[PDB]
């Protein structure tokens, strides 16, 4: 039946989507290397009424959320295995099935047979095999991972931490556990050494914190609540008008 | 009905009826921030200019 | 969703940015050759509504119409390039600038940055480098069996060898000066890169054209004045509280509008 | 959660490092052939919201 119920229902759903985005931003305020999300709303089709000029709307629909890829603040972890990125770049991490995902969480560990892995246990490529009797692990600004051994007065080069740069950082698919996979909107993963070809630098002992600003989220929650109340009132008004119509 | 609209070429029309001033129908400089005074004086500001 | 709430959001953002500036100034109190920052704010948009100056009553104009404005936006943060207090550490390798010059340093990627921190070190090859391992320009090289290193007030560097009563000059330390020192882009690590708003690098030896004089054994401490920072804390806190009060008042108004 | 909080947190760690260096220097006053330490600090990241 022609009515205004659907138009306000779309408004309620849009406010729900915005609140979901805000809640996701707030819940991940402690994750390392997290980019805040912003939902973009852009209205539905319009119905044109012809005179012997006027256009009536239909509602609002969420289109696409954008992740803000600004450089987050650094926090000091005092762990030699953690590296943060100064600039634009992604660590490449190999999933068990074989496809390579891309992460910015720089909290790494050494697994039982050498090997640098992420917190979830997935290996970081290229294979960087730390020796067992290592005394101190040093990761340089340009991604050179050198290992000191007792006796030898010179550190031993083990591997290079290459950064994968995408031309469009927003189009990567967020697969879940702090990992992105390349997509048609973020194609051509460009492998580079850190420091050249636009790649970022590496700080050892620091981890990149989340990008979520708090004041924006709280005031946006206030706006979402009040707009939700407004749309609920519109729904109630349409309900009362239809009730008055049916009683004839 | 005082809901005055501006046509593409600058004619002032109310409900499609061209408004008539002291000199006849009004021709507004195409594209202008129209301000009406307390006695009907029309002032037109062209975009970009001071 | 309502104009006053957006204006208060902009105000909150501006006061927060002021707080970040204050915190950044405070965290770098012990940093050598640091310059404190100050943020400048400007007015945002102004909705025209009634145009001021439009003729009412044919012969009377309308003064000061409805210029309803939006919030605030920070223009930019400008560094205060003033001389910090000199601290004596009695070291042959600490150099302090007393005027308006910069040391030139080469990044390994090929370009050159500019630093004011004068705590210099020697690598395994004998070159004068920065504490972050960046090789200072020019590549002043220090001999192996050096007994004493003397950096003069004109930037000349001398090394006293054994069996030679006369010091041998092994380099010349120059200072880089710019048309606009605030336009340098700070990349961290006490390093500035040249931008198009900072003109072009002007090389000058220390004492002429304006470059400052180099002191040995001294370090240029940060110019951060901390009591001013505390007073700025007090404001940055009240102003934020008052903007939050405005947010709350708008929230109450919207709530009563909804409830009816 | 707030950038100012992180900046202060670092500053606190830096000052604690300075305090530890001073304490270690004072603890080794009577030891022979000792070389006192000194910590050097540098600027962290610089957010370029508007490019200079």
Q: Token pair of C234, please? A: 């007090």
Chain C interface residues facing chain D, Cβ-Cβ under 8 Å?
Answer: 16, 19-20, 22-24, 26-32, 34, 76, 89, 117, 119, 131-132, 182-191, 195, 197-198
Q: At what angle do helices C3-27 and D3-27 cross, to 10 degrees?
A: 10
**Chain C residue with Cα closest to B50:** C53
Report DSSP state, residue C88.
E
**Chain C residue with Cα closest to B40:** C57
Q: What is the distance between the alpha carbons of residues A164 and B30, in angstroms, rounded to a whole number?
A: 54
Length of chain A: 248
Contact by Cβ (8 Å): C177, C189: no
Burial A25-62 (b: 16+ CB within 10 A, else e): beebbeebbbbbbebeeeeeeeeeeeeeeeeeeebbeb
Determine the distance in angstroms separating the CA of C1 from the nearest CA of chain A, rounded to an integer.
6
Residue A76 CB neighbour total at 10 angstroms: 17
Name residue, tokens 């590496």: A202
Pick from B1, B15, B6: which is nearest to B45 by CA?
A: B6
Q: Name residues whose C-beta falls within 8 Å of residue B5's C-beta, 6 or more positions apart in sequence.
A: B12, B13, B14
Say yes or no for a CB contact (<8 Å) between D1 and A212.
yes
Q: Token pair of A136, please? A: 């101190």
Report DSSP state, residue B26.
-
Q: Token pair of A170, please? A: 């927003």
Query: What distances in angstroms separate CA A33 from CA A15, A36, A169, A183, A248, one per listed residue?
Result: 27, 10, 14, 20, 61
Say yes or no for a CB contact (<8 Å) between A71 and D47.
yes
Name residue, tokens 């803000």: A68
Say yes or no for a CB contact (<8 Å) between C9 and A219.
yes
The torsion angles phi and psi of C175, rounded to 5 degrees, stand at -120, 140
**Chain D residue with Cα closest to C180:** D52
Q: Biggest alpha carbon distance in chain C?
A: 100
Contact by Cβ (8 Å): C137, C104: yes
Say yes or no for a CB contact (<8 Å) between C13 and A215.
yes
Say yes or no for a CB contact (<8 Å) between D45 and A212.
no
Resolution of this entry, Å? 3.3
Say yes or no for a CB contact (<8 Å) between A73 and D13.
no
Say yes or no for a CB contact (<8 Å) between A73 and D1.
no
Q: Name residues whose C-beta falls within 8 Å of residue A244's C-beta, 6 or more positions apart in sequence.
A: none
Question: Which H or E run includes B20?
Answer: strand B20-21
Q: Name residues whose C-beta falls within 8 Å of residue A241's C-beta, 6 or more positions apart in sequence.
A: none
Burial of C243 (0-12, 13-18, 19+ CB in 10 A): buried
Say yes or no for a CB contact (<8 Å) between C188 and D50.
no
With touching defined as 3 or more inter-chain CB pairs under 8 Å, the answer for chains A and C is: yes
Size of interface B-C (CB pairs under 8 A): 28
Name residue, tokens 């919030």: C71
Secondary structure class of C104 (helix, strand, coil):
strand
Residues in chain C closer than 8 A to B43 (CB atoms) = 51, 54-55
Up-side HSE of residue C164: CA atoms within 13 Å toward CB? 12
The torsion defined by the Cα of A204, A206, A211 and A213, in degrees rounded to 10, comes to -150
Determine the distance in angstroms separating the CA of D29 from the nearest CA of chain C, rounded to an integer.
18
Pick from A164, A159, A154: which is nearest to A188 by CA?
A: A164
Q: What is the distance between the alpha carbons of residues C165 and A220, in angstroms, rounded to a whole number?
A: 75
Q: Token pair of D9, please? A: 């947190």
Pick from C84, C25, C89, C1: which is nearest to C226 by CA?
A: C25
Q: What is the distance between the alpha carbons of residues A202 and A159, in angstroms, rounded to a whole number?
A: 14
The torsion defined by the Cα of C151, C153, C154 and C160, in degrees rounded to 10, comes to -30
Name residue, tokens 């630093």: C115
Say yes or no for a CB contact (<8 Å) between A219 and C109.
no
One DSSP character per residue, C173-199 reads --EEE-S-STTSEE-STT-EE--GGG-
| Breakpoints of chain C, after residues (C–N > 2.5 Å) | none
HEC per residue, chain A:
CCCCHHHHHHHHHHHHHHHHHHHHHHHCCCCCCCCCEEEEEEECCCEEECCCCEEECCCEEEEEEEECCCCCCEEECCCCCCEEEECECEEEEECCCCCEEEECCCCEEEECCEEEEECCCCEECCCCCCCCCEEEEEECCCCEEEEEECCCCCCEEEEECCEEECCCCCCCEECCCCCEECCHHHCCCEEECCCCCCECEEEECEEECCCCCHHHHHHHHHHHHHHHHHHHHHHHHHHHHHHHHHCC
Question: Which H or E run includes C25?
Answer: helix C3-27
How far, rounded to the nearest angstrom, does the alpha carbon of residue A227 sit from its chain's CA centroid? 26
Q: Give bridge partners of residue A76 from the DSSP assignment.
A: A206
| Mutation site, C13, C24, C221, C233, interface D, largest D CB count within 10 A | C24
First CA to last CA across chain B, in angstroms? 32
Contact by Cβ (8 Å): A56, A46: yes
How far, rounded to the nearest angstrom, does the alpha carbon of residue C3 sit from its chain's CA centroid? 35
Q: What is the distance between the alpha carbons of residues A103 and A35, in angstroms, rounded to a whole number?
A: 11
Q: What is the distance between the alpha carbons of residues C243 and D4, in angstroms, rounded to a whole number?
A: 18
Q: What is the distance between the alpha carbons of residues A76 and D28, in angstroms, rounded to a whole number?
A: 28
Determine the distance in angstroms separating the CA of C143 from the nearest CA of chain A, rounded to an integer.
23
- Please indicate the experimental technique that yielded this structure: cryo-EM
């Amino acid at each position: 039946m022609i009515s205004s119920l659907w138009i306000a229902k779309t408004g309620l759903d849009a406010q729900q989507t915005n609140m979901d985005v805000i809640a996701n931003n707030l819940a991940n305020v402690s994750t390392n290397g997290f980019k805040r999300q912003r939902a973009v709303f852009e209205d539905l089709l319009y119905q044109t009424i012809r005179q012997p000029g006027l256009q009536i709307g239909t509602g609002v629909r969420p289109v696409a959320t954008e992740r803000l890829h600004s450089q987050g603040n650094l926090s000091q972890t005092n762990n030699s295995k953690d590296v943060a990125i100064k600039g634009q770049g992604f660590f490449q991490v190999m999933l068990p099935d074989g496809t390579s995902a891309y992460t910015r969480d720089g909290s790494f560990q050494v697994d039982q047979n050498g090997q640098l892995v992420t917190a979830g246990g997935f290996q970081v490529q290229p294979a960087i095999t730390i020796p067992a009797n290592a005394l101190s692990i040093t990761i340089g600004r340009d991604g050179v991972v050198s290992v000191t051994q007792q006796g030898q007065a010179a550190p031993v080069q083990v591997g290079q931490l290459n950064l994968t740069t995408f031309m469009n950082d927003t189009g990567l698919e967020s697969i879940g556990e702090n990992l992105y996979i390349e997509t048609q909107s973020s194609g051509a993963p460009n492998e580079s050494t850190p420091g050249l070809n636009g790649a970022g630098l590496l700080y050892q002992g620091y981890v990149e914190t989340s990008n979520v600003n708090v004041a924006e989220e709280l005031v946006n929650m206030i706006q979402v609540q009040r707009a939700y109340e407004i749309n609920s009132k519109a729904v109630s008004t349409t309900d009362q008008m239809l009730q008055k119509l049916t009683q004839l | 009905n005082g809901n005055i609209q501006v046509g593409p070429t600058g004619q002032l029309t109310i409900q499609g009826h061209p408004v008539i001033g002291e000199g006849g129908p009004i021709t507004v400089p195409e594209g202008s921030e129209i301000t009406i005074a307390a006695d009907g004086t029309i002032s037109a500001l062209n975009p970009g200019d001071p």
